[PDB]
Amino acid sequence: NDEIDNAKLIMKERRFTASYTFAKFSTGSMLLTKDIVGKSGVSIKRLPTELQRKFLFDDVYLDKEIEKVTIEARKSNPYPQISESSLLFKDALDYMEKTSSDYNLWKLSSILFDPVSYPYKTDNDQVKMALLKKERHCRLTSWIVSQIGPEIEEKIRNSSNEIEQIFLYLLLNDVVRASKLAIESKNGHLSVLISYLGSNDPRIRDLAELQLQKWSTGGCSIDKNISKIYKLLSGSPFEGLFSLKELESEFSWLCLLNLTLCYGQIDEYSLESLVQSHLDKFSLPYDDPIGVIFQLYAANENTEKLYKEVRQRTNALDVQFCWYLIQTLRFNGTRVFSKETSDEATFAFAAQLEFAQLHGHSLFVSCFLNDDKAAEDTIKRLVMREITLLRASTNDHILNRLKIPSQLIFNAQALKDRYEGNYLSEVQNLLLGSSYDLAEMAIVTSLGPRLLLSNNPVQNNELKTLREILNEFPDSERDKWSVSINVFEVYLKLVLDNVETQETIDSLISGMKIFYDQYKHCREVAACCNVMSQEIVSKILEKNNPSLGQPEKAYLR
Amino acid sequence: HNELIHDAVLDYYGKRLATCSSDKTIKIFEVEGETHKLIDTLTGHEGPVWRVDWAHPKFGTILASCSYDGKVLIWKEENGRWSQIAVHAVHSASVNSVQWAPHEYGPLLLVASSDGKVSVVEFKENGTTSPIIIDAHAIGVNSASWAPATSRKFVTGGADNLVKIWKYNSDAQTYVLESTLEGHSDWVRDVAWSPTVLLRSYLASVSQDRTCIIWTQDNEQGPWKKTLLKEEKFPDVLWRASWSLSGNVLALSGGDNKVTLWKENLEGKWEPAG
């Protein structure tokens, strides 16, 4: 009761309230959100993962992304970077589910954001180059055609004009079938016209144009779909005298992209310019993810600007995906992209990978900071922070074997196992471990009252087999000895052989005096120097003041 | 039941949850799942013990904890049997913060109290606690914390509403007053410098008028842009907060027992994350 009002007036000096909460971050970046009922009085919360792809949880998919990458031994900093990302978007099409426009999204970038080429050389350069774009076009139009699959098949089933069915067959790219239905309407001359298609040529455009115009200055009544057949024939599906807006209220904008790439000339233009003229005509959403693929194939030329803007408008692509495009196509160079686009998307992606406790995969991503200090601090920090997450795989442990100096990660390891609660065997693993490359000062101060466990000849000669390593490795941090570790040269040759002082005894009383200073925090380590003294000078009549009273140095009396 | 906890920080390796409560004990629940196992009850302090802070290893781990009384007891393991090494008892009001430095700077313990003082409690192997006192505010300093962004500062936030960037000189092993920021009607409770691994640093000025003003810099020396997390008077006086090491999720605790995790999207403006 007394406690209640006490803590009230205390916490109103403090200007705290009687209900309080905190949650703070830790070594795997996770929360300790106080709730009041626990015996730790926290509920350790997972911070939500903003990246939840089911094929990150394969570590061989970490390894596929290392192999489509040329790893760069970098010369501003020793830590790994990437010289060349030729990263494929076909490396997740074997771990992904295969139904989803997540699969079609990632496939669309497999035709566009990774190359497509024709295998063997055709004789002229203009022809060679056209057959890369024609090969890319075979896959691409398959894609366009596949995805307008249901909407066209729905209207096949439904009641339709005869010429509305010929037009819809042609949308799924069927030519013979369309001719055969032309044949059935008793129209032979028409069926000739359906069997130009799949092909345009320049003379039929001028005749198709001349005939639509004959109609205008002609009488009344026309069919619309018949007018559509001549729009294909004019070579010009939208860029003729009529523009098709009857199929963006009934069909998609993708149903429009089929019309340019198949009857809006068949790659006598480049792809890139065709899809760009087709953005300008029809606004391809900034909100569909498969939409934005088209848009940054259209704006290949100066990608960076339109990419920043639409990354705010499409969040049904994940932060993985946004990062992937900058990586692949910046060391290929086809998309203008700064370094700092890659540096912002690296931080972001790596940071979500960390919230899933995928820090191996985080490491690999933070390597694609190709600003020099940025992959100094990030690589350093992420290894020194967590060790067991980076030995959780062998592929993890390869990324520390990579261009990282054993050295970093053993330095993380034994920094961790340096406590005071296990500390005899793991302060040995700074010296035995040798990433600190001599650091046995704290082994002096961890072998004070740990010669009080047993004295036997190779526990005696353990302090002359980690003290010969004093000189095998040159003086490094905390080091330069052979007064305080000329104690244990001659502690051996004292208690073995009765000695008339060889004057390394005279180094060792000084060394015990140095050792009294050092206690590095433990109960007694500055009175264990007495123990080791009063063990041994006492091999001449010599009494000297301790390292108290006279039996604390010598054991003569 | 556990009495009202006021901090429970974890190790640098993520093991020893230090629940320092209004029972005057820091209960070291060394974490193995839900077997947060009580390895020591740290009886010493004479009022409600508010903050813990662990040092990163280089010697062990040294827990430094602070309390109402004025005692920051320098807890260190001797084979897990924790005791004070020494006592830093210099502070005559309720001590706010305790907070260990990276070992780029040294083992420098940064202690502030709302008696006005901020001591750079420089530590040594001979088990001494060495204060380099400045008085940064005079209605009290309610936090002080370092600035290990890529450098070398501590920021103060206190009771006179000022937020003073103490940037480096080390002319004495205390830093000089670079600038002074202002924009609150009530006490800057917590100054949460971003411990990011990139050039940008932010500073969530978590306050008692409940304006969590994140002054957004785009660099070390950059502009102090008023782009508040919460741009209103959010319910109950806002308690302690930190920035993620990587991901920049402002874990803005309330006093309303919700922690508004509010990640960053690139424009220096803030959208939810739980």
Curated annotation (Swiss-Prot), chain A:
Residues bearing the modification Phosphothreonine? 17
How does this chain sit within the bilayer?
Answer: Peripheral membrane protein
Query: Subcellular localization, per the record?
Result: Nucleus, Nuclear pore complex; Nucleus membrane
> Where does the record place a coiled coil?
none
Protein name stated in the entry: Nucleoporin NUP145C
Q: Corresponding gene?
A: NUP145
Q: Which residues of the full protein are shown?
A: 735 to 1303 of 1317
Swiss-Prot record, chain B:
The WD repeats lie at: 1-39, 44-85, 90-131, 136-176, 183-225, 233-272
Entry's Gene Ontology BP terms: COPII-coated vesicle budding; ERAD pathway; mRNA transport; nuclear pore localization; nucleocytoplasmic transport; positive regulation of DNA-templated transcription; positive regulation of ER to Golgi vesicle-mediated transport; positive regulation of protein exit from endoplasmic reticulum
> Could you give a GO molecular-function term held by this entry?
structural molecule activity
Asked if the Swiss-Prot or TrEMBL record annotates the protein with the keyword RNA-binding, the reply is: no
Q: Note the SMART domains from the entry.
A: WD40
Signal sequence span is none
UniProt keyword annotations, A-Z: Cytoplasmic vesicle, Endoplasmic reticulum, ER-Golgi transport, Membrane, mRNA transport, Nuclear pore complex, Nucleus, Protein transport, Repeat, Translocation, Transport, Vacuole, WD repeat
Provide the topology term for how it sits in the membrane: Peripheral membrane protein
Instruction: Give a GO cellular-component term.
Output: endoplasmic reticulum
Give the matching InterPro entries. Answer: Sec13/Seh1_fam, WD40/YVTN_repeat-like_dom_sf, WD40_repeat_dom_sf, WD40_rpt
Where does the protein end up?
Answer: Cytoplasmic vesicle, COPII-coated vesicle membrane; Endoplasmic reticulum membrane; Nucleus, Nuclear pore complex; Vacuole membrane
- Taxonomy, superkingdom: Eukaryota
Q: Does the keyword Lipoprotein apply?
A: no
Query: What other remark does the UniProt record contain for this protein?
Result: Present with 21400 molecules/cell in log phase SD medium.
Q: What does this protein do?
A: Functions as a component of the nuclear pore complex (NPC) and the COPII coat. It is one of 5 proteins constituting the COPII coat, which is involved in anterograde (ER to Golgi) double-membrane transport vesicle formation. First the small GTPase SAR1, activated by and binding to the integral ER membrane protein SEC12, exchanges GDP for GTP and recruits the heterodimer SEC23/24, which in turn recruits the heterotetramer SEC13-SEC31. The polymerization of COPII coat complexes then causes physically the deformation (budding) of the membrane, leading to the creation of a transport vesicle.
Kindly state the subunit structure of this protein: The basic repeat unit of a COPII coated vesicle is composed of 5 proteins: the small GTPase SAR1, the heterodimeric SEC23-SEC24 complex, and the heterotetrameric SEC13-SEC31 complex. This repeat unit polymerizes to induce membrane deformation into a transport vesicle. Component of the nuclear pore complex (NPC). NPC constitutes the exclusive means of nucleocytoplasmic transport.
Q: Which family does it belong to?
A: Belongs to the WD repeat SEC13 family.
This chain belongs to which protein, by name? Protein transport protein SEC13
